[PDB]
Structure 1
């Protein structure tokens, strides 16, 4: 429901992600890298069309732009987490006005690519395909946890509306009910 920026676990969740994103361990990451990673995944691993990839890129671009990242600029850890506070509150503000959040826009873009039927719902195998391609999750075990937490069994599908809700609490408010959204892959 609300921000929780001084919760060491909120900082830890994003510190983990920051380190996951800083593959070359430069201690900084740029928007160029983020958008490269986003498009490399959908085009080279998930077979998205140029149009789909484009929509997905614009979404990823806005997402990390909301955290203050920019092209031709390297964001270090301190700026990153500070910038994340702003992203989180802006997202919360959009939420309040029933305005599409940046994370919502991303999900829609991504699910249209990952969902074979292009309906906004993906299977456990599709979730695994995406998560393991991006690297955010490494084991099938942690991917199942996602469904266990979203309340969808191995045969049902994860819907974007439901996942969005999960992300609001996982990434923005530290909602206790969203713990283990990514199994043990993300603190």
Structure 2
């Protein structure tokens, strides 16, 4: 039973996103742009994961939608406070879709990442594949933290992760500060 109640004023939820913001703020001037974010997704991440042009584009579209959901746009610098209020709007919009049994932006982003890793048609992500993602995206480079993610989640009998489980975890991790989601990224993200 995922937590659907928001906790936007919680110091821990704020710090989780402040951590992500600072992680995306390259030169550390206290601001980020959609340009820099999409570049990371397409020129860096997708390239190293050897995604096809179509997979790269699908992934790009998902990222653009996720961050535009935070009020971000190309050519505009965003400061943390504004980024955070934007994230609160994305979160409520996502929870509304969840309440309507409509696919969320984080679920669709997940589908795009999972497809890039869908080779033998496993339709899932293995520990090694996630380890690669953690390193290439930079969100969780430590092998230990990636192993912590898999120990944290409910895996199938083969030890692989499925998109519904990751979506479920992410909804609680990014949006509602679900106690069940705490620890999702080991020490990689608070």
**Fold-level match, TM-score > 0.5?**
yes
1:83 is aligned, of 72, 79, 86, to 86
What's the counterpart of residue 7 of structure 2? Answer: 4
- The answer to whether structure 1 residue 101 and structure 2 residue 104 are counterparts is yes
Query: Deviation at 1:152?
Result: 2.4
What's the counterpart of residue 178 of structure 1? Answer: 181
Query: Deviation at 1:120?
Result: 3.2
Query: Deviation at 1:63?
Result: 0.2
What's the counterpart of residue 163 of structure 2? Answer: 160
Written as runs of structure 1 = structure 2, the 5 A alignment for 1:31-50 is: 31-50=34-53
1:139-175: CA deviation from partner (whole Å, max 9, x where unpaired): 1110011111112289511100110000011110111
1:68-124: CA deviation from partner (whole Å, max 9, x where unpaired): 111110111111011111011001001000111000110001110023234431100
Counterpart of 1:39 in 2: which secondary structure?
helix
CA distance in 2, matches of 1:118, 1:47: 17
Cα pair 2:106 2:167 within 8 Å, conserved? yes
CA distance in 2, matches of 1:138, 1:110: 17
Q: What's the TM-score, normalizing by structure 1?
A: 0.96
Unaligned runs of 5+ in 1: none
Q: Tell me the number of residue pairs that the alignment of Structure 1 and Structure 2 aligns.
A: 187
Cα pair 2:169 2:184 within 8 Å, conserved? yes
What's the counterpart of residue 75 of structure 2? Answer: 72
CA distance in 2, matches of 1:73, 1:107: 26
CA distance in 1, matches of 2:41, 2:17: 18
CA distance in 2, matches of 1:117, 1:131: 21
Q: What's the TM-score, normalizing by structure 2?
A: 0.94
- The answer to whether structure 1 residue 114 and structure 2 residue 151 are counterparts is no
Instruction: Tell me which moved more, 119-128 or 84-93.
Output: 119-128
Unaligned runs of 5+ in 2: none
Alignment RMSD (CA, Å): 1.4
Cα pair 2:45 2:137 within 8 Å, conserved? no
CA distance in 2, matches of 1:12, 1:45: 29
Query: Deviation at 1:42?
Result: 3.7
